[PDB]
């Protein structure tokens, strides 16, 4: 854990700083062949657009296809992601991303929060760091708090096992020349 939420990732991969600000934040093939991989279809994504202060923003929009008996057919997913302006070319990248769902029982009571943090270590190295919160617009009670609790969290670990794991094969094809 750190301060933010549940600590996720936080590995070091030889892929330089910019080429996973890369592969996870633009529509890469990486990205494509992963959202496919976990039944995310409809990706929509707006450009990446300055604002005043520096930061820049895009929303997207997804659907992901559970096929499951305690969260339905399939939900919309929203998710607004934000390029904060103490990112640096090829040495730093922060993106804090704000994830609602549509449609799953319990959609209106919570969100989550994720934030992603590249790092240089070398030229062709960084760390990469991903800590998640779930937060409430409706604080629910007792079993539940606990039932919301239990599937958000073992989703998001499977989840983000998967992009760590996929990350390590993409590490194996950039660095074989």
Same mark, same amino acid.
């Given at each position: 854990? /750190? +301060?933010h939420?549940?600590?996720?990732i =936080?590995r070091i991969?030889?892929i330089?700083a910019?080429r996973?600000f890369?592969?996870?934040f633009?529509?890469?093939?990486?990205?494509q062949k992963?959202?496919?991989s976990r039944?995310i279809?409809d990706?929509?994504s707006?450009?990446?657009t300055?604002?005043l202060?520096?930061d820049q923003?895009?929303?997207m929009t997804?659907?992901?296809?559970l =096929?499951s %008996?305690?969260?339905?057919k399939c939900?919309?997913?929203?998710?607004?992601?934000?390029?904060?302006?103490?990112?640096r070319?090829a040495?730093?990248?922060l993106?804090?991303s704000?994830?609602?769902?549509?449609?799953?029982?319990?959609? /209106?009571?919570f969100?989550?929060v994720n934030?992603?943090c590249i790092?240089?270590?070398?030229?062709?190295?960084c760390?990469?760091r991903?800590?998640t919160?779930?937060?409430y617009?409706?604080? %629910?009670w007792?079993?539940?708090?606990s +039932?919301?609790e239990? =599937?958000?969290?073992?989703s998001l670990?499977?989840?983000f096992?998967?992009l760590?794991?996929d990350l390590?094969?993409?590490?194996?094809?950039?660095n074989?020349?």
């Amino acid at each position: 854990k /750190d +301060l933010h939420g549940r600590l996720f990732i =936080n590995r070091i991969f030889h892929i330089s700083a910019d080429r996973m600000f890369e592969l996870l934040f633009t529509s890469s093939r990486f990205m494509q062949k992963f959202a496919s991989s976990r039944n995310i279809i409809d990706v929509v994504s707006t450009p990446w657009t300055a604002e005043l202060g520096g930061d820049q923003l895009r929303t997207m929009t997804y659907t992901i296809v559970l =096929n499951s %008996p305690l969260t339905g057919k399939c939900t919309a997913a929203t998710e607004k992601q934000t390029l904060y302006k103490e990112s640096r070319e090829a040495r730093f990248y922060l993106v804090d991303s704000e994830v609602l769902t549509h449609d799953v029982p319990y959609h /209106d009571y919570f969100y989550t929060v994720n934030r992603y943090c590249i790092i240089r270590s070398s030229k062709q190295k960084c760390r990469l760091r991903v800590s998640t919160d779930l937060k409430y617009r409706k604080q %629910p009670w007792g079993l539940v708090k606990s +039932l919301i609790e239990k =599937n958000s969290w073992s989703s998001l670990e499977d989840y983000f096992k998967q992009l760590e794991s996929d990350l390590l094969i993409e590490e194996s094809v950039l660095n074989q020349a």
